[PDB]
Amino acid sequence: HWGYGKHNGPEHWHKDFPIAKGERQSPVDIDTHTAKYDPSLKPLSVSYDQATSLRILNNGHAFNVEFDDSQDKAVLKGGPLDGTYRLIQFHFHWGSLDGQGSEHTVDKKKYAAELHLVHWNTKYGDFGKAVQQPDGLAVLGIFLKVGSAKPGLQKVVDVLDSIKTKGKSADFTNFDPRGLLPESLDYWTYPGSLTTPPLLECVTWIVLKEPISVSSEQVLKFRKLNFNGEGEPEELMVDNWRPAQPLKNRQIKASFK
Ligand SMILES: NS(=O)(=O)c1ccc(NCc2ccco2)c([N+](=O)[O-])c1
Ligand code: NA
Ligand SMILES: [Zn+2]
Fold first, then answer.
1. Is 196 annotated as contributing to ligand binding?
2. Closest ligand 1 atom, residue 103 Cα
3. Are 92 and 115 in contact (CB under 8 A)?
């Protein structure tokens, strides 16, 4: 099955998932000098006050913080989006060292990690139907650099010991994702895909320009997770990122001048 290693990683995914070579794959490099300001783009409306987190899961690839998406409790709208997109989960991608880990790059710069807040378009009723649509998903991407600690991340860091291996989960109620945002909501946007199999081309990507800072100790704890299950040889969960893919016939738009 797919993963991030030499024999099952991104260079192999196309065999089982031929859309890996498709026309709107993610991530991409954001070439900042050619991303054109679009004055018709609206401010992003992130409404997370009523978010209800439920659980955190090590799925063998990353960890997902899952939300109650049976009502419009945490939603993303505005920006490039038409309608309303409901938060279902967030997760991260990160590196073995601070100089890599992000999926998107900015003028070829790799950040230490990247946070993805995943939302589905409520006009399709359920996530499974949304991922059959070219405008089914909106993913808010936020870069992480290593510096000062992010206070709102520490509750995540501290539960990771309890979900070390694939298939382990823990209660994770009352987590406020507002604590993971940067100050500015300036963004770049483009049409793309999921960055892991099944690589479905359903995503409006919204990538924030301002990184959040996390401490070295915080990211070091991400790197103590395991890809393997309990009682299997230890494979540290590091370098769970897909490299940049060809931009093809797409334009990245900037929300800011
Ligand atoms: N790195 S990402 O934000 O693009 C991403 C990748 C895969 C999946 N899911 C994979 C999957 C299984 C069935 C359909 O879809 C998700 N997600 O679900 O939020 C997000
Ligand atoms: Na452009
Ligand atoms: Zn992701």
1. yes
2. 1
3. yes
Expt. technique? X-ray
How many angstroms separate the CA atoms of 253 and 190, rounded? 7
Quick one: resolution in A?
1.0
93 is an annotated ligand-binding site residue: yes
Q: Is the CB of 131 under 6 A from ligand 1?
A: yes
Determine whether the shortest distance from the Cβ of 245 to ligand 1 is under 6 A: no
Contact yes or no for 213/148 (Cβ under 8 A): yes
From atom 18 of ligand 1, which residue's Cα is the shortest distance away? 118
Whole-angstrom distance, CA of residue 52 vs CA of residue 65: 10
Show which residues are catalytic: 61
**Structural domain containing residue 50:** 1-257
Lookup: tokens for 232: 């299997």
14 class by beta-carbon count within 10 Å (0-12 exposed, 13-18 middle, 19+ buried) = middle
Residue with tokens 């770049």: 188
| Gap between the Cα atoms of 173 and 67, Å rounded | 9
Distance CA 185, CA 209 (A): 8
Please count the structural domains in the chain. 1
- Distance of alpha carbon 53 from alpha carbon 44, whole angstroms: 22
Which atom of ligand 1 lies at the shortest distance from residue 193's CA? 4
